């Protein structure tokens, strides 16, 4: 079984970083919606949902490879 | 002046597409893995080592359970995918 870790501040840091990266990426690449003008609740929900998806994948992968 | 059709001159860009696709497929596949198929090496390096091992045993072909066939199939599959995508990107966009 691949090693997963208990919740810590590192897990929170990775999740927060992935969420913020996905929020900025969603600001830049979403075609149909000063830089945060037009920023609405569905776009925030989509970006934070991708942020949990990317953060979960990154946390599981870094726990797999030993970076924790 | 290679015509790809009756009256359609087209640049195949075989040197660039071949070189760029080879480098862009080989370099990511230098990532090592500890599985016995790779033997501690990357996919490209395990493939090259298997080539050397089986060329050291000429006439005698690699056996069915030998990792050469799986390494060759995966490496050439990824290489062909890279060559197709590189031909698409460079011949179409050109920028």
């Amino acid at each position: 079984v691949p090693q997963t870790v208990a919740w810590s501040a590192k897990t929170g840091a990775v999740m927060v970083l992935s969420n913020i990266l996905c929020i900025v990426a969603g600001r830049y690449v979403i075609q149909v919606k000063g830089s945060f003008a037009g920023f609405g609740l569905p776009e925030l929900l989509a970006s934070t949902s991708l942020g949990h998806i990317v953060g979960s994948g990154a946390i599981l992968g870094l726990s797999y490879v030993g970076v924790l | 002046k290679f015509e790809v059709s009756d009256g359609t001159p087209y640049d195949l860009n075989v040197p660039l597409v071949g070189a760029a696709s080879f480098i862009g497929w080989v370099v990511p596949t230098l990532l090592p893995s500890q599985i016995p198929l790779y033997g501690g090496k990357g996919l490209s390096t395990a493939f090259f080592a298997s080539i050397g091992t089986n060329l050291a045993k000429f006439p005698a072909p690699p056996g069915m359970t030998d990792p050469f066939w799986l390494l060759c199939f995966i490496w050439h599959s990824g290489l062909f995918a890279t060559m197709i995508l590189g031909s698409i990107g460079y011949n179409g966009y050109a920028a």
Binding site: - | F2, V4, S5, F58, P59, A60, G92
Partner: protein
């Protein structure tokens, strides 16, 4: 950038100009084949085509025939190839008899005299190519075992 165009710039003919059909590689290969290469008499077209086809005809008969496990496997395979060559020459002859009218023109394949010249060249080339394959397999042990002599 379109790769498929109407054939011969004619949109109503029953053909399309495709990379497989009309590229530079395809045009060079087709124009350099002996059936289409310029400057050849029909007899020499027959000679080249017959040499190639009669040369490769020996192999399947030698390796897979009913006498393949006997010491006379190559002799039987060559004889079977020669019989197939004679049958195909008869086919060529009757095709030319029923297909062409007797005309003065003799420099083209699709004339009566031209087809007779092509048939003569194909017979001589097929016999020569089959005999060459027989000689090479008879004298080289690599060809007898299809490479297994190296093991």
């Amino acid at each position: 950038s379109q790769f498929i165009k109407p054939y011969n710039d004619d949109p109503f003919v029953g053909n399309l100009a495709t990379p497989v059909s009309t590229s530079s590689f395809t045009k060079s290969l087709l124009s350099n084949l002996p059936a289409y290469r310029a400057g050849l008499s029909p007899l020499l077209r027959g000679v080249e085509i017959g040499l190639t086809h009669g040369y490769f005809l020996v192999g399947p008969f030698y390796k897979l025939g009913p006498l393949r496990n006997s010491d006379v496997a190559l002799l039987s395979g060559f004889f079977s190839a020669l019989g197939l060559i004679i049958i195909l020459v008869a086919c060529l002859t009757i095709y030319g008899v029923v297909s062409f009218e007797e005309t003065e023109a003799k420099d083209q394949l699709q004339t009566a005299k031209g087809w007779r010249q092509f048939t003569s060249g194909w017979l001589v080339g097929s016999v020569g190519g089959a005999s060459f394959a027989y000689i090479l397999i008879s004298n080289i042990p690599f060809l007898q075992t299809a490479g297994m002599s190296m093991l």
